[PDB]
Amino acid sequence: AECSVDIQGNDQMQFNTNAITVDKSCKQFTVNLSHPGNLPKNVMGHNWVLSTAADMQGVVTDGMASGLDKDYLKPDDSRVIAHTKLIGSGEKDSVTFDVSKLEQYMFFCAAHAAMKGTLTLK
Ligand SMILES: [Cu+]
């Protein structure tokens, strides 16, 4: 089994996939986020955030209200299963989470909530 994925967010405000699979045998899963291109984090920074699909809009609403100071996520939001730091070009971050926390899930960038995709156990 594959229990990690590499994902990119670029200067064009897009991730390089819209779908992540978590093998049903994994007990931990690691997301390795990178940022090809050239724009720094104060221009085009990205993160990677995981919630249920049903919770995504509420996470984004409360994150918007929390603002830039908090990477557009409400601190300690119970609906956020895992998230990375905000990265700019040439930077990287990885997050690992317990698969026991996984229903339909989605990932998104809190800076650019249009950047999104699905995560599913398979
Ligand atoms: Cu972003």
UniProtKB/Swiss-Prot annotation:
Cu cation binds at H46, C109, H112, M115. GO terms for molecular function: copper ion binding; electron transfer activity; identical protein binding; transition metal ion binding; zinc ion binding. Coiled coil: none annotated. PROSITE patterns: COPPER_BLUE. It holds the Pfam family Copper-bind. Residues 1-122 form the Plastocyanin-like domain. InterPro entries: Azurin, BlueCu_1, BlueCu_1_BS, Cu-binding_ET, Cupredoxin. Its main location: periplasm. Disulfide bonds join C3-C26. It comes from Pseudomonas aeruginosa (strain ATCC 15692 / DSM 22644 / CIP 104116 / JCM 14847 / LMG 12228 / 1C / PRS 101 / PAO1). It is found in: Periplasm. The keyword Disulfide bond applies. One of its GO terms (cellular component) is plasma membrane. This is Azurin. The keyword Translocase does not apply. Keywords: Copper, Disulfide bond, Electron transport, Metal-binding, Periplasm, Signal, Transport. Transfers electrons from cytochrome c551 to cytochrome oxidase. It comes from the Bacteria.
